[PDB]
Design a protein around this ligand. Structure first.
Ligand SMILES: Cc1cc(C)cc(NC(=O)Nc2ccc(S(N)(=O)=O)cc2)c1
Ligand SMILES: [Zn+2]
Length: 257
């Protein structure tokens, strides 16, 4: 099955998922001098006050924190978006070294990691339907650089020992995702795809300008997760990122100047 290794990684994915070579694939490089300020872009509306976290899971490709999305509790609106998108899950992509790990890049610069807050358009009723639509998902992408610790990340870091291997999960209630956001909601936006198989072209990408800082100890604990399951030889979960894909016939827009 697909993964991030030499024999099953991003260069192989197109054989099972031919849309890998499609017209709106993610991630991309954000060339900051070529992105155009769009004064008609509204401010983002991130309404996470009522967010209800559920469980944290190692799925063998990342770890994911899930949310109750059966009501409008944690929603993303505004920006380039029409309508209301419910928070389903967040997860990360990260590197083996601090100079790599993000999926999007900024003027070819790679960050140590990238947070994806995944939301789906409620007019499609459920996330499975939404993934089949060009405006079905909105993913808020946030870069991580290594420096000062991010206090709002620490409860995530604390529990990773209990989900070390593929297939493990733990009860992760009462987590506040607002503690993962930077100060500014300035953003770039473009139409794209899921960055993991099936690579569906269903995502409005919203990538924040301002990275969050995390400590070396925090990201080191990401790197101690395992791709393997329990009772298998250890393979460290690192470098779970897809590289930048051709921009093709797309323009990246900026909410700021
Ligand atoms: C928790 C959950 C439940 C269900 C029914 C579906 C999903 N699927 C999902 O979140 N897919 C997805 C894959 C890749 C990205 S990325 N890496 O482009 O942000 C986002 C969502 C996730
Ligand atoms: Zn992702």
């Amino acid at each position: 099955h697909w993964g991030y290794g030499k024999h099953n990684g991003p260069e192989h994915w197109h054989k099972d998922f031919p849309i890998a070579k499609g017209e709106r694939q993610s991630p991309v490089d954000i060339d900051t001098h070529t992105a155009k300020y769009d004064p008609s872009l509204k401010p983002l509306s991130v309404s996470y006050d009522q967010a209800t976290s559920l469980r944290i899971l190692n799925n063998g490709h990342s770890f994911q924190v899930t949310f109750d999305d059966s009501q409008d509790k944690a929603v993303l609106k505004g920006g380039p978006l029409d309508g209301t998108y419910r928070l389903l899950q967040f997860h990360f992509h990260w590197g083996s070294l601090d100079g790599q790990g993000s999926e999007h890049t900024v003027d070819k610069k790679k960050y140590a990691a990238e947070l994806h807050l995944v939301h789906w358009n409620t007019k499609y009723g459920d996330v499975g339907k939404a993934v089949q639509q060009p405006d079905g998902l909105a993913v808020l992408g946030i870069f991580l650089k290594v420096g000062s610790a991010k206090p709002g990340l620490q409860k995530v870091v604390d529990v990773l020992d209990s989900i070390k291997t593929e297939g493990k999960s733990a009860d992760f209630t009462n987590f506040d995702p607002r503690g993962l956001l930077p100060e500014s909601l300035d953003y770039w936006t473009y139409p794209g795809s899921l960055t993991t198989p099936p690579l569906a072209e269903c995502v409005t990408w919203i990538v924040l300008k301002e990275p969050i800082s995390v400590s070396s100890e925090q990201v080191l604990k990401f790197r101690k997760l395992n791709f393997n399951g329990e009772g298998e030889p250890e393979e460290l979960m690192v470098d779970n990122w897809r590289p930048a894909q051709p921009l093709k016939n797309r323009q990246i827009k900026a909410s700021f100047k």
